[PDB]
Design a protein around this ligand. Structure first.
Ligand SMILES: Oc1ccc(CNCc2cccs2)cc1
Length: 283
C-alpha cells in the first residue's frame, strides 16, 4: 500500500502495536559474540543491546578492538551510517578514535546528557574554547571552536587532533536538544528541519566517512533519524515514489543493527516524518 493512506488505515483501526510486533517477529537474528565476551562488559551500556559481529565497527588497536557501534550500509539509497550508544566514562576515547579512523565529518546526538534525572551519556565534548580535552588512552585532543545555539538544536565546530601525527580535522556536532523525556514529538517539523541541516553540511555525503549517530542505546531515536533520511532519499531516486515501503526499509536496516525503532510510537512518528517531509521536498 502507499504510505499516507496505510497510515490513516492503521490510525483508524488502532493497530500500531500489532504492526510493530510483526516487525519485531520478522527481524534478523545474527550472532554478537564479541560484544558478550567478559572483557567487554564495561564497554556496553545495556546488556540487551549489542552490535552484530558481521557489521560491527572495529577499532584499529591490537589489544581490544571492541566498541558498541554498527555500520548500516544502504545499497540502493547509496548512504551509510554508523549507529552507536552514547559514550560511557571509560569509552569516550574509543568513541573519538572511531570518528578519526572512519574519516567521519559529522556526529549526530539525539539525547541530552541528563534525562529523567539520570545520566544518559558522558560529557564527551568540551564546553569552553579555552578548556580543551585530552584522551590519553587513544592520544587525541579535542577543542571547541564555535557553538551556535538555536531553539530546537545546537551546532558546534570541533577540532580533533591526532597527537601521534599532529594531523587535524574539523568535526561538526549536530545536537538535537528538544526530544521529550517521554514519548515522541507531537509534530515532526523540527526533527525534519534538523535532518535537513545535517544534510546541508555535507556530513552525509560520499566524500566523507559515514556520519556517526547516537542516542542513549543507539537504536531508538537513532533508528528514526536514519530511517527517515533513507526513505526520503529513495522517494527522490525512484520513478514511482509511492513504491517506497517503510516497513521493508526498516527490516533491511535491522540486518545491520538489532532493535532499530524501540516502540510503536516511534514507528508512527517515523511514518509521520516521511509523509510530511515528502511534501516539502517538492511541491
Ligand atoms: O562500567 C560499566 C559497568 C557496567 C556497565 C553495564 N554493563 C551491562 C552488561 C553488558 C553485558 C552484560 S551486563 C557499563 C559500564
Amino acid at each position: 500500500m502507499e504510505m499516507e493512506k496505510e497510515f490513516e488505515q492503521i490510525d483508524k483501526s488502532g493497530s500500531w502495536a500489532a504492526i510493530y510486533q510483526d516487525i519485531r517477529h520478522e527481524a534478523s537474528d545474527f550472532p554478537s559474540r564479541v560484544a558478550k565476551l567478559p572483557k567487554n562488559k564495561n564497554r556496553n551500556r545495556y546488556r540487551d543491546v549489542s552490535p552484530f559481529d558481521h557489521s560491527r565497527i572495529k577499532l584499529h588497536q591490537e589489544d581490544n578492538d571492541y566498541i558498541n557501534a554498527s555500520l548500516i550500509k544502504m545499497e540502493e539509497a547509496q548512504r551509510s551510517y554508523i549507529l552507536t550508544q552514547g559514550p560511557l566514562p571509560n569509552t569516550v576515547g574509543h568513541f573519538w578514535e572511531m570518528v578519526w579512523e572512519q574519516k567521519s565529518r559529522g556526529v549526530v546526538m539525539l539525547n541530552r546528557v541528563m534525562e529523567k534525572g539520570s545520566l544518559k551519556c558522558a560529557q564527551y565534548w568540551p564546553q569552553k574554547e579555552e578548556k580543551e580535552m585530552i584522551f590519553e588512552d587513544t592520544n587525541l585532543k579535542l577543542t571547541l571552536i564555535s557553538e551556535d545555539i538555536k531553539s530546537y538544536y545546537t551546532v558546534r565546530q570541533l577540532e580533533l587532533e591526532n597527537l601521534t601525527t599532529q594531523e587535524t580535522r574539523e568535526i561538526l556536532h549536530f545536537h538535537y536538544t528538544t526530544w521529550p523525556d517521554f514519548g515522541v514529538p507531537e509534530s515532526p517539523a523540527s526533527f525534519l528541519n534538523f535532518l535537513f541541516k545535517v544534510r546541508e553540511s555535507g556530513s552525509l555525503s560520499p566524500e566523507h566517512g559515514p556520519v556517526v549517530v547516537h542516542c542513549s542505546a543507539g537504536i531508538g531515536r537513532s533508528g528514526t533519524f536514519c530511517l527517515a533520511d533513507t526513505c526520503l532519499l529513495l522517494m527522490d531516486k525512484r520513478k514511482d515514489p509511492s513504491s517506497v515501503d517503510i516497513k521493508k526499509v526498516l527490516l533491511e536496516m535491522r540486518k545491520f543493527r538489532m532493535g532499530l525503532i524501540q516502540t510503536a510510537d516511534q514507528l508512527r512518528f517515523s511514518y509521520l516524518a516521511v509523509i510530511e517531509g515528502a511534501k516539502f521536498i517538492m511541491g
